[PDB]
Protein backbone atom coordinates (compact mmCIF):
# COMPACT_ATOMS: atom_id res chain seq x y z
CA UNK A 1 0.00 0.00 0.00
CA UNK A 2 3.05 2.27 -0.44
CA UNK A 3 4.38 2.37 -3.99
CA UNK A 4 7.85 3.22 -5.26
CA UNK A 5 8.75 3.55 -8.91
CA UNK A 6 12.20 2.68 -10.23
CA UNK A 7 13.29 4.40 -13.42
CA UNK A 8 15.76 3.06 -15.99
CA UNK A 9 17.95 6.12 -15.34
CA UNK A 10 18.36 5.22 -11.66
CA UNK A 11 15.85 7.61 -10.04
CA UNK A 12 13.71 6.09 -7.29
CA UNK A 13 10.43 8.04 -7.56
CA UNK A 14 8.13 7.86 -4.52
CA UNK A 15 4.42 8.09 -5.16
CA UNK A 16 0.96 8.38 -3.62
CA UNK A 17 -1.30 5.48 -4.55
CA UNK A 18 -0.70 2.68 -7.04
CA UNK A 19 0.70 3.83 -10.44
CA UNK A 20 -1.01 2.76 -13.63
CA UNK A 21 0.64 0.97 -16.51
CA UNK A 22 -1.38 1.63 -19.63
CA UNK A 23 -0.16 -0.74 -22.35
CA UNK A 24 -2.56 0.95 -24.71
CA UNK A 25 -0.74 4.28 -24.47
CA UNK A 26 2.69 3.17 -23.28
CA UNK A 27 2.43 5.51 -20.29
CA UNK A 28 2.64 5.11 -16.54
CA UNK A 29 0.26 7.38 -14.61
CA UNK A 30 0.86 8.52 -11.04
CA UNK A 31 0.41 11.06 -8.27
CA UNK A 32 3.49 12.44 -6.52
CA UNK A 33 3.51 14.08 -3.06
CA UNK A 34 1.93 17.47 -3.83
CA UNK A 35 -1.23 15.90 -5.26
CA UNK A 36 0.01 16.17 -8.86
CA UNK A 37 -1.13 13.76 -11.58
CA UNK A 38 1.88 12.82 -13.66
CA UNK A 39 2.80 10.62 -16.63
CA UNK A 40 6.07 8.97 -17.49
CA UNK A 41 6.99 6.90 -20.52
CA UNK A 42 6.62 3.26 -19.58
CA UNK A 43 9.90 2.75 -21.41
CA UNK A 44 11.72 4.90 -18.84
CA UNK A 45 10.25 2.78 -16.00
CA UNK A 46 12.00 -0.43 -14.95
CA UNK A 47 10.22 -1.55 -11.74
CA UNK A 48 7.01 -0.96 -9.77
CA UNK A 49 7.54 -1.62 -6.05
CA UNK A 50 4.64 -2.17 -3.65
CA UNK A 51 5.76 -1.94 -0.01
CA UNK A 52 3.27 -3.83 2.12
CA UNK A 53 2.19 -2.17 5.34
CA UNK A 54 2.03 -4.12 8.62
CA UNK A 55 0.34 -3.24 11.92
PDB file of N, CA and C in Angstrom:
ATOM      1  N   UNK A   1       0.829  -1.243   0.000  1.00  0.00           N
ATOM      2  CA  UNK A   1       0.000   0.000   0.000  1.00  0.00           C
ATOM      3  C   UNK A   1       0.857   1.284   0.000  1.00  0.00           C
ATOM      4  N   UNK A   2       2.148   1.142  -0.286  1.00  0.00           N
ATOM      5  CA  UNK A   2       3.053   2.275  -0.436  1.00  0.00           C
ATOM      6  C   UNK A   2       3.918   1.975  -1.649  1.00  0.00           C
ATOM      7  N   UNK A   3       3.644   2.643  -2.764  1.00  0.00           N
ATOM      8  CA  UNK A   3       4.379   2.371  -3.993  1.00  0.00           C
ATOM      9  C   UNK A   3       5.619   3.236  -4.240  1.00  0.00           C
ATOM     10  N   UNK A   4       6.598   2.608  -4.882  1.00  0.00           N
ATOM     11  CA  UNK A   4       7.854   3.225  -5.259  1.00  0.00           C
ATOM     12  C   UNK A   4       8.063   2.847  -6.713  1.00  0.00           C
ATOM     13  N   UNK A   5       8.560   3.787  -7.489  1.00  0.00           N
ATOM     14  CA  UNK A   5       8.753   3.554  -8.906  1.00  0.00           C
ATOM     15  C   UNK A   5      10.218   3.690  -9.279  1.00  0.00           C
ATOM     16  N   UNK A   6      10.809   2.616  -9.782  1.00  0.00           N
ATOM     17  CA  UNK A   6      12.201   2.682 -10.228  1.00  0.00           C
ATOM     18  C   UNK A   6      12.251   3.035 -11.711  1.00  0.00           C
ATOM     19  N   UNK A   7      13.140   3.960 -12.047  1.00  0.00           N
ATOM     20  CA  UNK A   7      13.293   4.402 -13.417  1.00  0.00           C
ATOM     21  C   UNK A   7      14.598   3.862 -13.983  1.00  0.00           C
ATOM     22  N   UNK A   8      14.593   3.577 -15.282  1.00  0.00           N
ATOM     23  CA  UNK A   8      15.762   3.061 -15.988  1.00  0.00           C
ATOM     24  C   UNK A   8      17.010   3.932 -15.787  1.00  0.00           C
ATOM     25  N   UNK A   9      16.812   5.228 -15.544  1.00  0.00           N
ATOM     26  CA  UNK A   9      17.945   6.122 -15.337  1.00  0.00           C
ATOM     27  C   UNK A   9      18.333   6.267 -13.855  1.00  0.00           C
ATOM     28  N   UNK A  10      17.941   5.274 -13.056  1.00  0.00           N
ATOM     29  CA  UNK A  10      18.357   5.222 -11.660  1.00  0.00           C
ATOM     30  C   UNK A  10      17.463   5.867 -10.622  1.00  0.00           C
ATOM     31  N   UNK A  11      16.755   6.936 -10.978  1.00  0.00           N
ATOM     32  CA  UNK A  11      15.852   7.610 -10.038  1.00  0.00           C
ATOM     33  C   UNK A  11      14.915   6.624  -9.349  1.00  0.00           C
ATOM     34  N   UNK A  12      14.553   6.942  -8.112  1.00  0.00           N
ATOM     35  CA  UNK A  12      13.710   6.087  -7.294  1.00  0.00           C
ATOM     36  C   UNK A  12      12.507   6.902  -6.809  1.00  0.00           C
ATOM     37  N   UNK A  13      11.638   7.238  -7.761  1.00  0.00           N
ATOM     38  CA  UNK A  13      10.430   8.044  -7.555  1.00  0.00           C
ATOM     39  C   UNK A  13       9.408   7.468  -6.574  1.00  0.00           C
ATOM     40  N   UNK A  14       9.177   8.199  -5.482  1.00  0.00           N
ATOM     41  CA  UNK A  14       8.130   7.861  -4.519  1.00  0.00           C
ATOM     42  C   UNK A  14       6.807   8.338  -5.090  1.00  0.00           C
ATOM     43  N   UNK A  15       5.719   7.709  -4.662  1.00  0.00           N
ATOM     44  CA  UNK A  15       4.418   8.086  -5.163  1.00  0.00           C
ATOM     45  C   UNK A  15       3.314   7.958  -4.114  1.00  0.00           C
ATOM     46  N   UNK A  16       2.123   8.422  -4.482  1.00  0.00           N
ATOM     47  CA  UNK A  16       0.960   8.377  -3.620  1.00  0.00           C
ATOM     48  C   UNK A  16      -0.128   7.595  -4.341  1.00  0.00           C
ATOM     49  N   UNK A  17      -0.329   6.355  -3.912  1.00  0.00           N
ATOM     50  CA  UNK A  17      -1.296   5.478  -4.549  1.00  0.00           C
ATOM     51  C   UNK A  17      -0.566   4.578  -5.519  1.00  0.00           C
ATOM     52  N   UNK A  18      -1.285   3.615  -6.087  1.00  0.00           N
ATOM     53  CA  UNK A  18      -0.703   2.677  -7.044  1.00  0.00           C
ATOM     54  C   UNK A  18      -0.663   3.277  -8.454  1.00  0.00           C
ATOM     55  N   UNK A  19       0.533   3.322  -9.074  1.00  0.00           N
ATOM     56  CA  UNK A  19       0.701   3.829 -10.437  1.00  0.00           C
ATOM     57  C   UNK A  19      -0.128   3.015 -11.411  1.00  0.00           C
ATOM     58  N   UNK A  20      -0.232   3.486 -12.647  1.00  0.00           N
ATOM     59  CA  UNK A  20      -1.010   2.765 -13.634  1.00  0.00           C
ATOM     60  C   UNK A  20      -0.271   2.555 -14.941  1.00  0.00           C
ATOM     61  N   UNK A  21      -0.040   1.291 -15.275  1.00  0.00           N
ATOM     62  CA  UNK A  21       0.639   0.966 -16.508  1.00  0.00           C
ATOM     63  C   UNK A  21      -0.387   0.770 -17.601  1.00  0.00           C
ATOM     64  N   UNK A  22      -0.490   1.749 -18.493  1.00  0.00           N
ATOM     65  CA  UNK A  22      -1.381   1.630 -19.628  1.00  0.00           C
ATOM     66  C   UNK A  22      -0.579   1.120 -20.816  1.00  0.00           C
ATOM     67  N   UNK A  23      -0.832  -0.128 -21.201  1.00  0.00           N
ATOM     68  CA  UNK A  23      -0.160  -0.744 -22.348  1.00  0.00           C
ATOM     69  C   UNK A  23      -0.779  -0.244 -23.627  1.00  0.00           C
ATOM     70  N   UNK A  24      -1.915   0.428 -23.522  1.00  0.00           N
ATOM     71  CA  UNK A  24      -2.561   0.953 -24.708  1.00  0.00           C
ATOM     72  C   UNK A  24      -1.964   2.292 -25.123  1.00  0.00           C
ATOM     73  N   UNK A  25      -1.343   2.987 -24.176  1.00  0.00           N
ATOM     74  CA  UNK A  25      -0.736   4.281 -24.470  1.00  0.00           C
ATOM     75  C   UNK A  25       0.777   4.263 -24.314  1.00  0.00           C
ATOM     76  N   UNK A  26       1.270   3.276 -23.572  1.00  0.00           N
ATOM     77  CA  UNK A  26       2.693   3.171 -23.275  1.00  0.00           C
ATOM     78  C   UNK A  26       3.082   4.256 -22.298  1.00  0.00           C
ATOM     79  N   UNK A  27       2.239   4.465 -21.290  1.00  0.00           N
ATOM     80  CA  UNK A  27       2.433   5.513 -20.294  1.00  0.00           C
ATOM     81  C   UNK A  27       2.103   4.999 -18.911  1.00  0.00           C
ATOM     82  N   UNK A  28       2.876   5.449 -17.931  1.00  0.00           N
ATOM     83  CA  UNK A  28       2.645   5.108 -16.539  1.00  0.00           C
ATOM     84  C   UNK A  28       2.100   6.368 -15.865  1.00  0.00           C
ATOM     85  N   UNK A  29       0.905   6.255 -15.288  1.00  0.00           N
ATOM     86  CA  UNK A  29       0.256   7.378 -14.612  1.00  0.00           C
ATOM     87  C   UNK A  29       0.493   7.326 -13.112  1.00  0.00           C
ATOM     88  N   UNK A  30       0.668   8.484 -12.485  1.00  0.00           N
ATOM     89  CA  UNK A  30       0.858   8.517 -11.036  1.00  0.00           C
ATOM     90  C   UNK A  30       0.644   9.879 -10.380  1.00  0.00           C
ATOM     91  N   UNK A  31       0.515   9.853  -9.060  1.00  0.00           N
ATOM     92  CA  UNK A  31       0.407  11.062  -8.267  1.00  0.00           C
ATOM     93  C   UNK A  31       1.695  11.133  -7.469  1.00  0.00           C
ATOM     94  N   UNK A  32       2.314  12.307  -7.379  1.00  0.00           N
ATOM     95  CA  UNK A  32       3.489  12.440  -6.520  1.00  0.00           C
ATOM     96  C   UNK A  32       3.047  12.840  -5.113  1.00  0.00           C
ATOM     97  N   UNK A  33       3.832  13.670  -4.438  1.00  0.00           N
ATOM     98  CA  UNK A  33       3.511  14.077  -3.065  1.00  0.00           C
ATOM     99  C   UNK A  33       2.641  15.330  -2.939  1.00  0.00           C
ATOM    100  N   UNK A  34       2.733  16.252  -3.893  1.00  0.00           N
ATOM    101  CA  UNK A  34       1.927  17.470  -3.827  1.00  0.00           C
ATOM    102  C   UNK A  34       0.584  17.328  -4.537  1.00  0.00           C
ATOM    103  N   UNK A  35       0.032  16.117  -4.557  1.00  0.00           N
ATOM    104  CA  UNK A  35      -1.231  15.897  -5.261  1.00  0.00           C
ATOM    105  C   UNK A  35      -1.156  16.364  -6.711  1.00  0.00           C
ATOM    106  N   UNK A  36      -0.172  15.847  -7.443  1.00  0.00           N
ATOM    107  CA  UNK A  36       0.007  16.169  -8.858  1.00  0.00           C
ATOM    108  C   UNK A  36      -0.058  14.915  -9.714  1.00  0.00           C
ATOM    109  N   UNK A  37      -0.992  14.887 -10.662  1.00  0.00           N
ATOM    110  CA  UNK A  37      -1.131  13.763 -11.585  1.00  0.00           C
ATOM    111  C   UNK A  37      -0.025  13.888 -12.623  1.00  0.00           C
ATOM    112  N   UNK A  38       0.724  12.807 -12.797  1.00  0.00           N
ATOM    113  CA  UNK A  38       1.878  12.820 -13.664  1.00  0.00           C
ATOM    114  C   UNK A  38       1.845  11.643 -14.646  1.00  0.00           C
ATOM    115  N   UNK A  39       2.730  11.672 -15.631  1.00  0.00           N
ATOM    116  CA  UNK A  39       2.797  10.615 -16.627  1.00  0.00           C
ATOM    117  C   UNK A  39       4.246  10.470 -17.013  1.00  0.00           C
ATOM    118  N   UNK A  40       4.686   9.234 -17.135  1.00  0.00           N
ATOM    119  CA  UNK A  40       6.067   8.973 -17.490  1.00  0.00           C
ATOM    120  C   UNK A  40       6.052   7.845 -18.509  1.00  0.00           C
ATOM    121  N   UNK A  41       6.896   7.948 -19.531  1.00  0.00           N
ATOM    122  CA  UNK A  41       6.986   6.899 -20.525  1.00  0.00           C
ATOM    123  C   UNK A  41       7.298   5.570 -19.872  1.00  0.00           C
ATOM    124  N   UNK A  42       6.423   4.598 -20.101  1.00  0.00           N
ATOM    125  CA  UNK A  42       6.616   3.259 -19.582  1.00  0.00           C
ATOM    126  C   UNK A  42       8.058   2.811 -19.831  1.00  0.00           C
ATOM    127  N   UNK A  43       8.555   3.122 -21.014  1.00  0.00           N
ATOM    128  CA  UNK A  43       9.899   2.754 -21.410  1.00  0.00           C
ATOM    129  C   UNK A  43      10.968   3.212 -20.408  1.00  0.00           C
ATOM    130  N   UNK A  44      10.768   4.382 -19.812  1.00  0.00           N
ATOM    131  CA  UNK A  44      11.716   4.895 -18.841  1.00  0.00           C
ATOM    132  C   UNK A  44      11.477   4.345 -17.435  1.00  0.00           C
ATOM    133  N   UNK A  45      10.548   3.397 -17.296  1.00  0.00           N
ATOM    134  CA  UNK A  45      10.249   2.780 -15.996  1.00  0.00           C
ATOM    135  C   UNK A  45      10.780   1.356 -16.025  1.00  0.00           C
ATOM    136  N   UNK A  46      11.491   0.939 -14.981  1.00  0.00           N
ATOM    137  CA  UNK A  46      11.995  -0.432 -14.954  1.00  0.00           C
ATOM    138  C   UNK A  46      11.373  -1.351 -13.894  1.00  0.00           C
ATOM    139  N   UNK A  47      10.852  -0.778 -12.812  1.00  0.00           N
ATOM    140  CA  UNK A  47      10.224  -1.555 -11.739  1.00  0.00           C
ATOM    141  C   UNK A  47       9.139  -0.803 -10.972  1.00  0.00           C
ATOM    142  N   UNK A  48       8.064  -1.507 -10.628  1.00  0.00           N
ATOM    143  CA  UNK A  48       7.010  -0.956  -9.773  1.00  0.00           C
ATOM    144  C   UNK A  48       7.045  -1.705  -8.433  1.00  0.00           C
ATOM    145  N   UNK A  49       7.370  -0.996  -7.359  1.00  0.00           N
ATOM    146  CA  UNK A  49       7.538  -1.615  -6.048  1.00  0.00           C
ATOM    147  C   UNK A  49       6.375  -1.306  -5.114  1.00  0.00           C
ATOM    148  N   UNK A  50       5.671  -2.340  -4.666  1.00  0.00           N
ATOM    149  CA  UNK A  50       4.642  -2.173  -3.650  1.00  0.00           C
ATOM    150  C   UNK A  50       5.252  -2.592  -2.312  1.00  0.00           C
ATOM    151  N   UNK A  51       5.243  -1.672  -1.352  1.00  0.00           N
ATOM    152  CA  UNK A  51       5.763  -1.936  -0.015  1.00  0.00           C
ATOM    153  C   UNK A  51       4.594  -2.198   0.925  1.00  0.00           C
ATOM    154  N   UNK A  52       4.417  -3.456   1.300  1.00  0.00           N
ATOM    155  CA  UNK A  52       3.275  -3.832   2.122  1.00  0.00           C
ATOM    156  C   UNK A  52       3.360  -3.124   3.460  1.00  0.00           C
ATOM    157  N   UNK A  53       2.209  -2.749   4.007  1.00  0.00           N
ATOM    158  CA  UNK A  53       2.187  -2.169   5.344  1.00  0.00           C
ATOM    159  C   UNK A  53       1.782  -3.240   6.366  1.00  0.00           C
ATOM    160  N   UNK A  54       2.361  -3.170   7.560  1.00  0.00           N
ATOM    161  CA  UNK A  54       2.026  -4.117   8.618  1.00  0.00           C
ATOM    162  C   UNK A  54       1.701  -3.373   9.916  1.00  0.00           C
ATOM    163  N   UNK A  55       0.683  -3.835  10.629  1.00  0.00           N
ATOM    164  CA  UNK A  55       0.341  -3.245  11.917  1.00  0.00           C
ATOM    165  C   UNK A  55       1.126  -3.893  13.056  1.00  0.00           C
TER     166      UNK A  55
END
